Amino acid sequence: MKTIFSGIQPSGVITIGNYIGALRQFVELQHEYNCYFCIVDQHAITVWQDPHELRQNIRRLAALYLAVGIDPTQATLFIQSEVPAHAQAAWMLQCIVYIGELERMTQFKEKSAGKEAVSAGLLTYPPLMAADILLYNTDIVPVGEDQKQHIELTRDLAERFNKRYGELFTIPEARIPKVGARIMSLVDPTKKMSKSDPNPKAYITLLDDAKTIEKKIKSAVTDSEGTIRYDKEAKPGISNLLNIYSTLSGQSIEELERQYEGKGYGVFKADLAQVVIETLRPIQERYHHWMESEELDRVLDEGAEKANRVASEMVRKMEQAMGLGRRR
Amino acid sequence: MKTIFSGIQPSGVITIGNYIGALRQFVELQHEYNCYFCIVDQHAITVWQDPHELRQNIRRLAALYLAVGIDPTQATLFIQSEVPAHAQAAWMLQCIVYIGELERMTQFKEKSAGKEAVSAGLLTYPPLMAADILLYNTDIVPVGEDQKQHIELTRDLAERFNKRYGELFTIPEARIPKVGARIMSLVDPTKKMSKSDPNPKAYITLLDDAKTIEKKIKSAVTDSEGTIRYDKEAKPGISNLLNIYSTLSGQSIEELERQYEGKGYGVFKADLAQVVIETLRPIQERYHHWMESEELDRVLDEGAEKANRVASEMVRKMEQAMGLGRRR
Ligand SMILES: Nc1ncnc2c1ncn2[C@@H]1O[C@H](COP(=O)(O)OP(=O)(O)OP(=O)(O)O)[C@@H](O)[C@H]1O
Ligand SMILES: Nc1ncnc2c1ncn2[C@@H]1O[C@H](COP(=O)(O)OP(=O)(O)OP(=O)(O)O)[C@@H](O)[C@H]1O
Ligand SMILES: NC(=O)[C@@H](N)Cc1c[nH]c2ccccc12
Ligand SMILES: NC(=O)[C@@H](N)Cc1c[nH]c2ccccc12
Ligand SMILES: [Mg+2]
Ligand SMILES: [Mg+2]
Ligand code: NA
Ligand code: NA
């Protein structure tokens, strides 16, 4: 069967945006493909992370992967840094990527937008991501519409290495959901929801309690119209809320528009909070079970062992094509 | 005792400039310090290298290290890529270095001077070099005057990591010879001799045969004065040749100025070629012995084993201070 790879950074607690855009689909995909799902801690430090907070966020992300239903016997779950090959292939790939290609990435221009001094990791993020994917001969990369351009560069890099040194890498293809590929911030409907947004009101984490989910949905930005109808350009806040309600409930935007005829932002909002709470409930319960067992560590040990087996062999192949080291 | 680290890229065959500025001193230093001498193949690919040529240049550099007298029982000789920790600590360090710091490196501005599209590795060279050094708790770094600024940045990075995360790294100090820290190109006395200069006349490799050394010294650029006297500003070509003659023969510039009174660039040049030939003779003989034995591979295996032991433990410490991975 075909291979899948996808990573999420332990730069905070994952949000409903991360769930709807990616994680949710991992759960379905694990049965039809050979999957590698990564906790990308080396990507997380491209910006400051308190060390104690990072260690803790890494463990929570693993518990959340498993809590949503990723079966460790059907997929490989591992931590990026526990597989040295990622850093090794990242260096090889950054020797083939052009500076201009890196400088043109929208994520870089964005995240580096308005900053005086920025880490080089911010700029060199892409080649490490390309390595993450290419090491496993990945066919499909489920994301995450904001990740489209990175995957396009990954394809460019794979082809360049392939034509420069000889066919080695599989050319990966992105898989972006038709719905929910870009959930927006609750506080700024023109920006996507991000787990590292300095304003916690912008996102809902999978670990938010009921009272917190209620407040965040309550203060979500809308408009003075008072009409619950989908209009991304005119009513961006209300359209995003409609989108979340829809993908989480299984109801179409059309159906929700009708159900909410003659209402009523206050009631639409209160209902939505409960829908999100009911969704996270079973996830949170399973999360707590994982956080308190040694089983969590064993799954990660097993996953790194399998990932190291595959990646280190691709690194050997890469070194051989480039002429690094010695004949092995 | 104190620790020493120094690396040379297998981007070509090392030159008399590499020998006079660094390698020669490794031989003396190995008895008074704990030394790690590296074949930096990951630095070499920051620019294009034909894979077959790189594999071969890596083996030749190792044979040359040993041929000049590096004793594998007194020092650790290893290949950079065979120690994954270099790439791992390079990534961690590139997450703490600022882009502006990288853009201001003279080596980068130089090597990227006049190029349309340049690899990111060119720009991110410094953090990998900082990793090479810092992984071993290095006290002294013998180079190589052109490497002073890289070592100053390495100190900046060590301090930053130390104050940001906690004391871990030793602050290294450069050790640059009083004489021969910057041997110049034979063809362009205003530029240093470089093993990758597109013009082979610019440098003399340790593997050049007699006829080749004679030609290169013969066509070395001088001046129309015809006087053999040291004047770096007025007579840059003749001053560089005087410098090479001096460090290789053991005679002072003063002594050579006198010996060559009433001469005679043609004779000064012919004499110099023989002095360089006589110097390389015993080195080349030992080089051939190493190139044809399996002993060369065993020394490198042993060296990587020792280097991996030390480096991987520093990487564990680095990850722990940054919060990467899991408590180990
Ligand atoms: N608002 C969003 N809507 C749908 N998918 C998203 C959204 N934000 C991120 N994703 C997807 O989530 C995955 C993990 O991305 P990532 O770990 O960078 O999350 P993030 O919230 O954007 O974090 P950070 O703010 O630290 O960058 C990727 O597949 C990504 O495209
Ligand atoms: N002209 C020179 N004179 C004295 N030392 C030198 C000279 N060129 C390089 N070195 C020293 O040689 C060592 C190895 O450097 P390196 O491998 O980059 O050599 P290089 O000749 O400059 O190669 P390249 O042209 O590929 O960059 C360092 O210690 C460096 O400072
Ligand atoms: N969302 C992000 O910022 C991605 N860069 C996360 C990521 C890192 N490595 C990956 C490999 C495959 C898919 C996704 C990823
Ligand atoms: N000459 C050069 O271009 C150096 N960057 C070579 C080098 C790579 N790593 C090192 C570590 C210590 C000393 C020197 C080096
Ligand atoms: Mg992101
Ligand atoms: Mg150089
Ligand atoms: Na599977
Ligand atoms: Na020693």
From Swiss-Prot, chains A, B:
Listed EC numbers: 6.1.1.2
Please indicate which superkingdom the organism of origin belongs to: Bacteria
Q: Quote the record's activity regulation.
A: Inhibited by indolmycin, a competitive inhibitor for tryptophan.
PROSITE patterns the record matches: AA_TRNA_LIGASE_I
User: What SUPFAM superfamilies does this protein's entry cite?
Assistant: Nucleotidylyl transferase
UniProt binding sites for L-tryptophan? D132
Q: Where in the cell is it found?
A: Cytoplasm
Q: In the record, what terms sit under GO molecular function?
A: ATP binding; tryptophan-tRNA ligase activity
What's in the keyword line of the UniProt record? Aminoacyl-tRNA synthetase, ATP-binding, Cytoplasm, Ligase, Nucleotide-binding, Protein biosynthesis
> Per the record, what are the reactions this protein catalyses?
tRNA(Trp) + L-tryptophan + ATP = L-tryptophyl-tRNA(Trp) + AMP + diphosphate + H(+)
Q: Which residues form a coiled coil?
A: none
Q: Which CDD domains does this one have?
A: TrpRS_core
Q: Which GO terms describe its biological process?
A: tryptophanyl-tRNA aminoacylation
Q: Where is this motif: 'KMSKS' region?
A: 192-196
Binding-site list for ATP: Q9, P10, S11, G17, N18, G144, E145, D146, I183, K192, M193, S194, K195, S196
- Motif extent ('HIGH' region): 10-18
From the record, give the cysteines joined by S-S bonds. none
What GO cellular component term, any one, is given? cytosol
List all membrane-crossing ranges. Answer: none
**Binding partners and assembly:** Homodimer.
Job description of the protein = Catalyzes the attachment of tryptophan to tRNA(Trp).
Name the family. Answer: Belongs to the class-I aminoacyl-tRNA synthetase family.
Known HAMAP family for this protein? Trp_tRNA_synth_B
Put simply, this protein is called Tryptophan--tRNA ligase
Q: Which organism is it from?
A: Geobacillus stearothermophilus (Bacillus stearothermophilus)
Whichever gene encodes this chain, its name is: trpS
